[PDB]
């Protein structure tokens, strides 16, 4: 017996990255998993590096970020890499979730990897939100103010909870120090859950674009997927390079290069682009508590896909109506994103409400209806 199989430790690596049996027909959308692993590694490497130069005190935080930009060798690169890779992490994560929804990766027997995935997505949001605060620029402060005042809508204890998280009566030094500690920690938690969702997946193996079993025709993960993953790594690094070196501030908001000023409120508190759809959902509900619940439900509702998809067939490759519905769903999710950055003005107020209804009705009405009807069409249509 070969060492990689004999030795317990080596065998675990072997089972995940080398002899792991994969379907032979995974397409390029199966590569976002490894890109998210690469993002997570770049964020750990750049993040730990910035932590060696950053000071979490509010009197010094913004200045420490300027020190990184101006004095630390390659600090500009480490800072922009960290900031931009946070955007790329969300591009890859939305793509990976999109792949999973389109190909029915959430169906049995993969409900557990999917459900852990939904938690990874929440931790990523929290992680990125706290990281944003650490700069202690105007968007940092006004972000922490508004987002932590949503917690005030929790009845009875809401106010108390906010003051407890801030460590004071406003966002200030205590808040900044604690977000630093948590922002450092949360990516390690996120890594553990990423690893759990893979261990959970190992029981069924990867789904594939046809949605049939792959037990009939397997390929070792290495070398086939190793070398396929390099193509998207280099494609990713090309996109990374264009942002980091040539347009490092294209994805960001200039307001964060103004130091936090609790008195002056900025022109426009809009979150980072990747949070914008959830922000639009929250604005759609007039009630404060309603809005918060809706915003959280917009993420947690992904957990019910395993129930509401009633198809006897896994994935959309063969389902023309489901493909159209999914196209509308994805475009609506982008329109929500856009509505998150417009001003609360006519006619975007009503439009945002309609898009929010469409978002929820996909999971609650349309997907259950459409998947039921397609079942009947496959059966009658093939008689």
């Amino acid at each position: 017996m070969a060492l990689r199989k004999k030795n317990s430790l080596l065998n675990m690596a072997n089972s995940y990255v080398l002899d792991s049996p994969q379907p032979s027909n995974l397409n390029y959308f199966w590569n976002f998993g490894s890109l998210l692993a690469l993002c997570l590694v770049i964020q750990l490497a750049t993040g730990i590096t910035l932590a060696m130069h950053y000071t979490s005190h509010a009197s010094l935080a913004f200045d420490s970020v300027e020190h990184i930009m101006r004095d630390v060798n390659f600090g500009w690169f480490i800072r922009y890499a960290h900031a931009n890779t946070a955007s790329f992490f969300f591009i890859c994560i939305y793509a990976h979730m999109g792949r999973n929804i389109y190909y029915g990766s959430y169906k049995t027997p993969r409900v557990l990897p999917w459900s852990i995935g939904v938690i990874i997505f929440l931790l990523l949001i929290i992680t990125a939100f706290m990281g944003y605060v650490l700069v202690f620029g105007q968007m940092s402060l006004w972000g922490a103010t508004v987002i932590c005042n949503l917690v005030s809508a929790i009845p009875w204890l809401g106010e108390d909870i906010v003051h407890f998280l801030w460590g004071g009566f406003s966002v200030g030094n205590p808040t900044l120090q604690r977000f630093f500690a948590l922002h450092y920690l949360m990516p390690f938690v996120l890594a553990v859950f990423a690893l759990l969702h893979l261990i959970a997946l190992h029981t069924a193996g990867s789904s594939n674009p046809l949605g049939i079993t792959s037990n009939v025709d397997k390929l070792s993960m290495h070398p086939y997927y190793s070398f396929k993953d390099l193509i998207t790594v280099f494609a990713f690094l090309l996109m990374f390079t264009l942002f980091v070196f040539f347009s490092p501030d294209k994805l960001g908001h200039p307001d964060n290069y103004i130091p936090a000023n609790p008195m002056v409120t900025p022109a426009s508190i809009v979150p980072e682009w990747y949070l914008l759809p959830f922000y639009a959902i929250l604005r759609a509900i007039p009630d404060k508590l309603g809005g918060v619940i809706a915003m959280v439900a917009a993420i947690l509702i992904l957990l019910i896909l395993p129930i509401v998809d009633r198809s006897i067939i896994r994935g959309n490759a063969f389902k023309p109506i489901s493909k159209l519905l999914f196209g509308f769903f994805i475009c609506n999710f982008l329109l929500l994103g856009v509505l998150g950055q417009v001003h609360i003005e006519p006619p975007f107020i009503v439009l945002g409400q309609i898009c929010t209804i469409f978002y929820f009705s996909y999971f609650l009405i349309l997907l259950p209806m459409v998947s039921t009807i397609e079942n009947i069409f496959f059966y009658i249509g093939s008689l």
Binding site: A45, F74, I78
Partner: protein, 56 residues
Amino acid sequence: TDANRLFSYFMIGSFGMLSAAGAKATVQDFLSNMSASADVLAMAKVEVKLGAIPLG
């Protein structure tokens, strides 16, 4: 032919060569962040008077 195998290993080896050159560049540039920063390097070069200092 040996010509035939050699060609494909030239592609693999080029890829290994750029990866090695790229990794060296990446590592060297990235870890240089840990070397003394510009503000530190500026606080060298201390100038001191001698008029104040008595004998012994």
